[PDB]
Design a protein around this ligand. Structure first.
Ligand SMILES: CCCCCCCCCCCC(=O)SCCNC(=O)CCNC(=O)[C@H](O)C(C)(C)COP(=O)(O)O
Ligand code: SF4
Ligand code: SF4
Lengths: 112, 379, 176, 208, 88, 115
């Protein structure tokens, strides 16, 4: 096992496959409560399914780091945790609803 | 819990301390707020160029380059290759000047004053290079939004080469004074530790990122001019403290010497400003012989060139970190808005978190390691 | 590519530990720093003997402003106000009228030297090389008022410094 | 295009357009417009209510993760009913990309503070409050950061005069620094530089 | 005695005395039942200053919400008594 | 219609409550400010200055403007209490070095063209 991931404050994760599997399963569980037609649900489910399939088919850590294209599996775990937190907050926010209101007539006209 | 207001670069610092511990550090700024961004709205782009020399005074050349890159992007033009090579060479010289200033001052505040003099001799030599290329030692206004103002004199490259082949010994002497000294390590090691996540969230940039192990450098990730044609290494820290940032800065100076060597050996021929008289002024002889050249000289020095409407955010890897400009043009020859982004602003905003649970004397070390120049912070 | 600055692991064998203990107790690196300072004491200092010796300068150096004239003795300035227009600090004030012989000449040409940033934009905007930034930098003053130059002061500066100014222009004009 | 013209980059243009469409699809509740400039810069115009969500998304989404806040500032456009436009510049190190998020407000409508998303915003919003008078709700401590203590007004507003309204001197009678209405020995010279004969036909406006 | 017994009479004397100290109400025109806004002609800020005078005379704190409804010396005395639960 | 987002207060009553709270805080602070900054003014005239500054804005009928003014006044009080201001900043409220400007028509006609 390696030591000192190289990022200050990022601990070396022993047994990262189980942690990644748990995090992705929780993410999918949260995404299941978002309406089926919402773009965020479909996009995040696709990304999470790809990542989960890639961690399930690769036992070697370094090969997993190369396949995931995030590198340093600890920060992949960190990004999964961030995605879970965002998924919960987005289920609260419901941003798939129609636009709140249009801007005034020339709000974004440039020049002048 | 006692409260002290360390008043009047120039900095006011209101602290609450519980005994020796620093419980709260609150910087009050604006003692050098001159309203640069409002004043820029009353100038043409050429007239606004010299403010960037005064923004971060320690490294004048880099600010010129950032402003010129923003204006060039808005103008949809590009500078000639020789201008780009000169820009990168003088940017690396500028980096050496800033690094010497940051390192010596940090040491001087820490109580070691010898290398300040030792390396300010070299700073004087680099000021000589500035003056020979532009006529001014420090407020140069050399790098313009069309290239550079003037070509190098016929003997400048040789003198730069002579200077640069002796500087590594000066860096070695500075290290002999500092790197392995136990007092210096006790003053710097494990002081102001910042995690990678906190550094990213607090808006840090430059060495303030790379000391925590973040592999990021704008000259590598988002190259401008010819930085993709030069080879160098990015020093990376491992503990996120003052000592690692000092090592990174020292290493960076050596890398800058490497880049300067490459720039010297690969300087190309050709013109120094874009061959477009509606942007860059013509030569004096052309202005005094050709009707179009005289008209374009007159208009470029009275009205200035019009910049097509639009907004850009242009950032460069400055000596102190990411230095950026958000420039909004309304189509006329005067910028509508010019927001200046300074790395030291975010670094000083993070000083409060960085100094938690430290001595009062550690605050000085943390301020020194943040590389804070007041003019850029206040603008 | 990237480099590690502080990624070395100390050896833990007895000889290396004893070396580190000897450094800790006998103060070896402090003696090394003392030796560096001692070596610096015995080399020649870099100080020059001002005002008998002066720092190096360039023909491009910008100093005190001057108004030049033609060899016939008539002033070069024809009151186009390009220097006034380009001045980033608004430090130039110009007023002009036809002369007694119909020539286009200035009646007022003031430079506020306490507003000037010495950028040299005026001398490059000038179409006739009338306003220049001459080589003099030793013109400090006891009052604020004497730094508000009128046309007479600038013409006197030109007549005073013309030899050196013309030599510098001859040296540098092929770069402009 | 010859050597004096800046070269184009269609690959980055396509990538930024696709990601802008992606972001607009994911958050239709707040995204009002998406634009990519000819020099490959992506901006997203949103409703003021979506400052906290959108930023959070752009910080935390696996495909976006814009973890750095480069700059936050305001622009004053007096002709608009909503006077101020708030600009966020975000940087993603994972994908080596930059994004800009724009919203709007007027003199009296508060904008949600984003210190919970980015700590770096803490001072930036303060500066905005100092220079434009835009109030940020739920800011940890909102106060002036750049102007003098007791300074009246917000200088970066377009209608604020360049030299201000008061100036400082030392008075011997009261033995202290005092502030008096501004009086210039030489008034700033206003230059009318804009020429007729428009420069850029591609930005011409309809004559209405 | 460390603290004298407090009665409605003593509270009233203290209240009308500190009103007499207030320089915008002349002594001869005020009374126990005199309204602040009309019989004496005072604005809300005058009433707020009177409430602070009450606070620093009786040595306790009066919240704004119930301090805003004390419009007479009589109801001020009633509020003080109710907060203190006096007998007479 | 004319529906707008609030800042702090929904109607004028909450705004006046906030105004009264700020006024109480300033009134309490005045004597300590007088003593700490070694001011030569009296507490009475300092409180008169506070009253005058409050009365300058007495014509506002918009709750958003009212609580924005309350926010600014609270910022000013914060600056005063924490001694971030100096004596000059506090004394700037009194304009002691400015010669008085007459208001009548004849004096203005005599001094110049300014109405
Ligand atoms: C040493 C001195 C230093 C200077 C002091 C600092 C100055 C800070 C001043 C800031 C003022 C504000 O924030 S608050 C601005 C005042 N607010 C309003 O005027 C809203 C509606 N008007 C009213 O309510 C009445 O005019 C009113 C008389 C207020 C009450 O009357 P009642 O009684 O009928 O209720
Ligand atoms: S040097 Fe620059 S600032 Fe000075 S007078 Fe000439 S143009 Fe103006
Ligand atoms: S000094 Fe030169 S630029 Fe200035 S008004 Fe005279 S001729 Fe024109």
């Amino acid at each position: 096992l390696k030591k000192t991931t190289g990022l200050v404050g990022l601990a070396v994760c022993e047994t990262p496959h189980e942690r990644l599997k748990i995090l992705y399963t929780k993410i999918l569980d949260v995404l299941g409560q978002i309406p089926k037609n919402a773009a965020y649900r479909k996009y995040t489910e696709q990304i999470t399914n790809e990542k989960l399939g890639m961690v399930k088919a690769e036992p070697d850590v370094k090969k997993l780091e190369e396949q995931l294209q995030g590198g340093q599996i600890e920060e992949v775990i960190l990004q999964a945790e961030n995605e879970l937190s965002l998924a919960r907050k987005m289920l609260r926010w419901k941003p798939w609803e129609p636009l709140v209101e249009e801007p005034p007539a020339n709000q974004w006209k440039w020049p002048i | 819990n006692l409260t002290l207001n360390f008043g009047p670069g120039v900095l006011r610092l209101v602290m609450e301390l519980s005994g020796e511990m620093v419980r709260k550090c609150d910087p009050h700024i604006g003692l050098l707020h001159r309203g640069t961004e409002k004043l820029i709205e009353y100038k043409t782009y050429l007239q606004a160029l010299p403010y960037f020399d005064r923004l971060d005074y320690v490294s004048m050349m880099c600010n010129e380059q950032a402003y010129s890159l923003a204006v060039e992007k808005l103008l949809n033009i590009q500078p000639p290759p020789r201008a780009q090579w000169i820009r990168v060479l003088f940017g690396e010289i500028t980096r050496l000047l800033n690094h010497i200033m940051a390192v010596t001052t940090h040491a001087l505040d820490i109580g070691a004053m010898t290398p300040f003099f030792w390396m300010f001799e070299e700073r004087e030599k680099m000021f000589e290079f500035y003056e020979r290329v532009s006529g001014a030692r420090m407020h140069a206004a050399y790098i313009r939004p069309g290239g550079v103002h003037q070509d190098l004199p016929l003997g400048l490259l040789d003198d730069i080469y002579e200077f640069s082949k002796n500087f590594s010994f000066r860096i070695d002497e500075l290290e002999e004074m500092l790197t392995n000294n136990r007092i210096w390590r006790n003053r710097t090691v494990d002081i102001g530790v910042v995690t990678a996540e906190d550094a990213l969230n607090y808006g840090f940039s430059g060495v303030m990122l790379r000391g925590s192990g973040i592999q990021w450098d704008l000259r590598k990730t988002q190259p401008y001019d010819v930085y993709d044609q030069v080879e160098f290494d990015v020093p990376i820290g491992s503990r996120g403290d003052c000592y690692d940032r000092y090592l990174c800065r020292v290493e960076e100076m050596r890398q800058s010497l490497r880049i300067i060597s490459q720039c010297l050996n690969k300087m190309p021929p050709g013109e120094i400003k874009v061959d477009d008289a509606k942007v860059s002024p013509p030569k004096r002889a052309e202005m005094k012989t050709s009707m179009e050249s005289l008209i374009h000289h007159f208009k470029l020095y009275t009205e200035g060139y019009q910049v097509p409407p639009g907004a850009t955010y242009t950032a460069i890897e400055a000596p102190k970190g990411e230095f950026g400009v958000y420039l909004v043009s309304d189509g006329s020859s005067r910028p509508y808005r010019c927001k200046i982004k300074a790395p030291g602003f975010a670094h000083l905003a993070g000083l409060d978190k960085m100094s938690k649970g430290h001595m009062l004397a550690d605050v000085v070390a943390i301020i020194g390691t943040q590389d804070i120049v007041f003019g850029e912070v206040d603008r | 590519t990237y480099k590690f600055v502080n990624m070395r692991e100390p050896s833990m064998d007895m000889k290396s530990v004893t070396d580190r203990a000897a450094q800790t107790l006998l103060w070896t690196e402090l003696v090394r720093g003392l030796g560096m300072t001692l070596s610096y004491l015995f080399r020649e200092p870099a100080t020059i003997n001002y005002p008998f010796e002066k720092g190096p300068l360039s023909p491009r150096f910008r100093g005190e402003h001057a108004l030049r004239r033609y060899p016939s003795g008539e002033e070069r300035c024809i009151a186009c106000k390009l220097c006034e227009a380009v001045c980033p600090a608004q430090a130039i004030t110009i007023e002009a009228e036809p002369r007694a012989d119909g020539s286009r000449r200035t009646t007022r040409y003031d430079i506020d030297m306490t507003k000037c940033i010495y950028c040299g934009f005026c001398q490059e905007a000038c179409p006739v090389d009338a306003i220049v930034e001459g080589p003099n930098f030793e013109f400090s003053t006891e009052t604020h008022e004497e730094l508000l130059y009128n046309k007479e002061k600038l013409l006197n500066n030109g007549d005073k410094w013309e030899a050196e100014i013309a030599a510098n222009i001859q040296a540098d004009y092929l770069y402009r | 295009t010859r050597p004096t013209i800046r070269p184009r980059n269609d690959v980055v243009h396509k990538q930024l357009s696709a990601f802008g469409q992606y972001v607009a699809e994911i958050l239709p509740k707040y995204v009002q417009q998406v634009q990519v400039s000819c020099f490959n810069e992506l901006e997203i115009f949103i409703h003021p209510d979506g400052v906290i969500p959108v930023l959070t998304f752009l910080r935390d989404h696996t495909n976006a993760q814009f973890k750095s806040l480069a700059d936050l500032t305001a622009v004053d456009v007096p002709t608009r009913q909503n006077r101020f436009e708030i600009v966020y510049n975000l940087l993603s190190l994972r994908f080596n990309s930059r994004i800009r998020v724009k919203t709007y407000t007027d003199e009296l409508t508060p904008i949600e503070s984003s210190v919970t998303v980015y700590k770096a915003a803490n001072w930036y919003e303060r500066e905005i409050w100092d220079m434009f008078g835009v109030f940020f709700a739920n800011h940890p401590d909102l106060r002036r950061i750049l102007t003098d203590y007791g300074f009246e007004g917000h200088p970066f507003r377009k209608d604020f005069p360049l030299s201000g309204y008061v100036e400082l001197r030392y008075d011997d009678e009261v033995k202290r620094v005092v502030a008096e209405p501004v009086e210039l020995a030489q008034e700033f010279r206003k230059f009318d530089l804009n020429s007729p004969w428009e420069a850029f036909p591609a930005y011409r406006q309809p004559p209405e | 005695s460390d603290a004298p017994p407090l009665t409605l009479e003593a509270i009233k004397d203290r209240v009308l005395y500190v009103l007499k100290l207030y320089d915008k109400i002349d002594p001869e025109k005020l009374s126990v039942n005199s309204h602040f806004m009309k019989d004496l002609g005072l604005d809300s800020l005058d009433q707020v200053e009177i409430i602070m005078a009450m606070e620093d005379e009786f040595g306790f704190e009066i919240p704004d919400i119930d301090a805003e409804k004390l419009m007479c010396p009589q109801e001020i005395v009633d509020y003080i008594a109710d907060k203190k639960d006096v007998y007479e | 219609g004319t529906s707008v987002k609030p800042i702090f207060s929904r109607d004028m009553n909450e705004a006046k409550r906030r105004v009264r709270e700020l006024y109480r805080a300033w009134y309490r602070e005045v004597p300590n400010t007088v003593h700490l900054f070694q001011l030569d003014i009296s507490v009475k005239q300092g409180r008169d200055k506070v009253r005058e500054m409050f009365m300058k804005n007495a014509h506002v009928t918009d709750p958003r403007v009212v609580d924005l003014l309350v926010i600014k006044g609270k910022m000013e009080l914060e600056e005063t209490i924490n001694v971030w201001k100096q004596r000059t900043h506090i004394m700037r409220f009194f304009h002691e070095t400015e010669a008085p400007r007459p208001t009548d028509f004849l004096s203005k006609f005599y001094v110049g063209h300014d109405p």
